[PDB]
């Protein structure tokens, strides 16, 4: 099969700037490539065909280029409406294949995450469970790493994470991390910690608490 490679999952930009999204086919496909745009919850929308032709209605700021294996979708004077994901596709031969997509997000000044940790509630403990929650809010860039430690040792099983999309108001990102244990498991240890490492700091942001201790 022909592999379509979009090396950039995300690319930062600003309204008014110009951006170029790359896509490479594992073999020569001439000019038989198309570009699609997709916004959350919606179906893809055809933007470019035959490598450089715009479909009817598409804004003139969208231009495509390349022939053979290397292709580029370039957006000039980027508008807020242009913030979405873009996929390239070869429709030269079966099986038709798509690129993994490149997401366009707003550039902004780096921001350290605000970290909060919460112990399992009396309600959940009564039901035999214990989820420890950690919120890492309003940070930038999006890349962040969280680690859970129980009594000093890192814990990896039982962890579930969730990330928000770039906020429409402050262009920041937020994350939630939840460590779920059995009630008995939770009461077997004393120290619980959430540790986050972000570009904004050389040292991890640490938030901890000791069971039944204030």
């Amino acid at each position: 099969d022909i592999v379509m490679t979009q090396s950039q999952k995300f690319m930062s930009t600003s309204v008014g700037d110009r951006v170029s999204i790359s896509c490479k086919a594992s073999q020569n496909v001439g000019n038989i490539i198309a570009w699609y745009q997709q916004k959350p919850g919606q179906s893809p929308k055809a933007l470019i065909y035959l490598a450089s032709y715009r479909y009817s209605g598409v804004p003139d700021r969208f231009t495509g280029s390349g022939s053979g294996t290397d292709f580029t979708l370039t957006i000039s004077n980027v508008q807020s409406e242009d913030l979405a994901e873009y996929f390239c596709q070869q429709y030269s031969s079966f099986p038709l294949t798509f690129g993994a997509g490149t997401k366009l997000e707003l550039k902004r000044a780096d921001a350290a995450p605000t970290v909060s940790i919460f112990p399992p509630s009396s309600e959940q403990l009564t039901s035999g469970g214990a989820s420890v929650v950690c919120f890492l809010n309003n940070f930038y860039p999006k890349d962040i790493n969280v680690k859970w430690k129980i009594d000093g040792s890192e814990r990896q099983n039982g962890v579930l994470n969730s990330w928000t999309d770039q906020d429409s108001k402050d262009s920041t990102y937020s994350m939630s991390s939840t460590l779920t244990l059995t009630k008995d498991e939770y009461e077997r240890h004393n120290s619980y910690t959430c540790e986050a490492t972000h570009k904004t700091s050389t040292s991890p942001i640490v938030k901890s608490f000791n069971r039944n201790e204030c």
Binding site: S43, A46, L96, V133, L160, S174
Partner: protein, 220 residues
């Protein structure tokens, strides 16, 4: 003028089979191939196969051979895709799209969401997330709400009946052992809590439940 109207969402159990439809209008149905595409977060967009309505000839991605079956009803200008021996791996959004030999996929359907699960409709357990020892440092304090173990999506969540809208972050639901879990964060001034009450209001239409959970400051 060309339009592709796909059928609504589907929720089935593993091993079942579904038949999705894509109604074409605004153009000559038999003149263009109809393509089907699968989309998931982990696998991105994957071409399933195509069918020429003119005579029913089909072409399939080897990956979906035996999984999907494409057919059409010429008289009603409708395309169909059957997916069988379903498993959770088939859970995704499926699109139909009109193919142009040289112009690619110019028109797409709105997509049909397929959920394959062994889970049954269940209301969530709503747990309060109060900072440890009810402490805080700055002039603000963050509280949370944990909506655990519900099916299917979605749930609606507000803080203090929506009166608290700023400083709120509700995280995308995450699947876990057949059920969904979601959390929401709310930040207020320290002069607001615990002085005033902060409550998480959670509704799960599918099970007809509505719950309000007050965030209480607590000690060991």
């Amino acid at each position: 003028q060309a339009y592709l109207q796909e059928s609504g969402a589907e929720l089935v159990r593993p091993g079942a089979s579904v038949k999705m439809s894509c109604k074409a209008s605004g153009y000559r149905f038999t003149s263009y191939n109809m393509h089907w595409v699968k989309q998931t977060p982990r696998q991105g967009l994957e071409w399933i196969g195509a069918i020429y309505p003119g005579n029913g000839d089909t072409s399939y991605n080897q990956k979906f051979k035996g999984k999907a079956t494409l057919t059409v009803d010429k008289s009603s200008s409708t395309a169909y895709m059957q997916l069988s021996s379903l498993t959770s791996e088939d859970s995704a959004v499926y699109f139909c799209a009109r193919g142009r030999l040289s112009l690619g996929f110019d028109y797409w359907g709105q997509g049909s969401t397929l959920t394959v699960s062994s889970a049954k409709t269940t209301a969530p357990s709503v747990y309060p997330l109060a900072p440890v020892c009810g402490d805080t440092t700055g002039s603000s304090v963050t509280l949370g709400c944990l909506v655990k173990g519900y099916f299917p999506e979605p749930v609606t969540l507000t803080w203090n009946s929506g009166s608290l809208s700023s400083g709120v972050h509700t995280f995308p639901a995450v699947l876990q052992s057949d059920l969904y879990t979601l959390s929401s964060s709310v930040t207020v001034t320290s002069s607001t809590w615990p002085s005033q009450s902060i409550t998480c209001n959670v509704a799960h239409p599918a099970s007809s439940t509505k719950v309000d959970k007050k965030i209480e400051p607590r000690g060991p």
